């Protein structure tokens, strides 16, 4: 145990910087393309959410 | 093969290699410490880390300001 | 319809943590650095995503907008470095 | 921008984490992008502080011990 430190600037480091198109772009599942029902929080909504969150944090 | 004596030799070899790697790490760490410009001691480390924390705080403040100027209803109008 | 996502913390690969460390200036890493990094990022993401989801829920919506995340990060900035 | 974490794994991870808080949810792409940018900035800052903590202890190899030490200096737990 307690082996050597894994070098990070060794040779072949450009392999960690290869481009992968399957993973370098967000997929469509789980995203919102229908651009309504995205209304911003009103002040009452935001204040209620934050006070509920503070009560929850106190509960922990 | 896995005798007690064979375990003593292995443990001694690993201890000596650990001392060697510790000396090498110390040399490289001093080289990097002067390469980064941090003064020796513990309080210098804490001061540098907290200064970087202040810098990152202002940076994320600017970032959230950009996000608000781009996506908020106040910025749009 | 009960689709579940699972074990995507491995999506933070060893090269991802290596790129993060190199961006941070790290020269060498320990073997158990990857798991600690995964745990730290998972806790961070959980704590911010819970607040973003609470904002979305109070907005009576079911999609998390950018301002939800903005307010979640603003609230997190007050509690993350409060020394506890 | 530069490449630290790939976009699809981070998106899948965020949705996995979120599904444990509300059942069926969507995400604006800008929200996922802000999440990724904040997470990467936080992690690279933590790695800088961890590297400082490691080179103070005469090491260039960072360890979870140094990560937790940097987190304790920054004010997290």
Residue numbers in the entry:
A (entry chain G): 65 to 124
B (entry chain D): 172 to 248
C (entry chain F): 18 to 101
D (entry chain E): 58 to 134
What do the authors report?
From biosynthesis to assembly into nucleosomes, histones are handed through a cascade of histone chaperones, which shield histones from non-specific interactions. Using structure-guided and functional proteomics, we identify and characterize a histone chaperone function of DNAJC9, a heat shock co-chaperone that promotes HSP70-mediated catalysis. We show that DNAJC9 recruits HSP70-type enzymes via its J domain to fold histone H3-H4 substrates: upstream in the histone supply chain, during replication- and transcription-coupled nucleosome assembly, and to clean up spurious interactions. With its dual functionality, DNAJC9 integrates ATP-resourced protein folding into the histone supply pathway to resolve aberrant intermediates throughout the dynamic lives of histones.
Our truncation analysis identified a HBD (amino acids 171–249) located in the C-terminal part of DNAJC9. To prevent disulfide cross-linking during purification Cys243 of DNAJC9 was mutated to serine, which did not influence histone binding. We obtained crystals of DNAJC9 HBD C243S in complex with histones H3.3 (57–135) and H4 as well as MCM2 HBD (61–130) and solved the structure at 2.50 Å resolution by molecular replacement using our previous structure of the MCM2 HBD-H3.3-H4 complex (Huang et al., 2015) (X-ray statistics in Table 1). Two copies of DNAJC9 HBD-H3.3-H4-MCM2 HBD quaternary complex are found in an asymmetric unit, which are almost identical with a small root-mean-square deviation (RMSD) of 0.47 Å. The structure shows that the HBDs of DNAJC9 and MCM2 co-chaperone an H3.3-H4 dimer. MCM2 HBD wraps around the lateral DNA-binding interface of the H3.3-H4 dimer (Huang et al., 2015; Richet et al., 2015; Wang et al., 2015), while DNAJC9 HBD recognizes a relatively hydrophobic surface located mainly along the H3.3 α2 helix. DNAJC9 HBD adopts two α helices labeled αA and αB, each about 30 residues long, which are connected by a loop Lb. The αA helix of DNAJC9 HBD interacts with H4 L1 and H3.3 L2 loops, while the αB helix forms an antiparallel coiled coil-like structure with H3.3 α2 helix. Interestingly, the N-terminal half of the αB helix sterically prevents H3-H4 tetramerization, which otherwise forms within the MCM2 HBD-H3.3-H4 complex (Huang et al., 2015) and the nucleosome (Luger et al., 1997). Moreover, the C-terminal tail of H4 adopts a helical conformation following recognition by DNAJC9 HBD, distinct from the conformations observed in other chaperone-histone complexes (Elsässer et al., 2012; English et al., 2006) and at the nucleosome level (Luger et al., 1997).
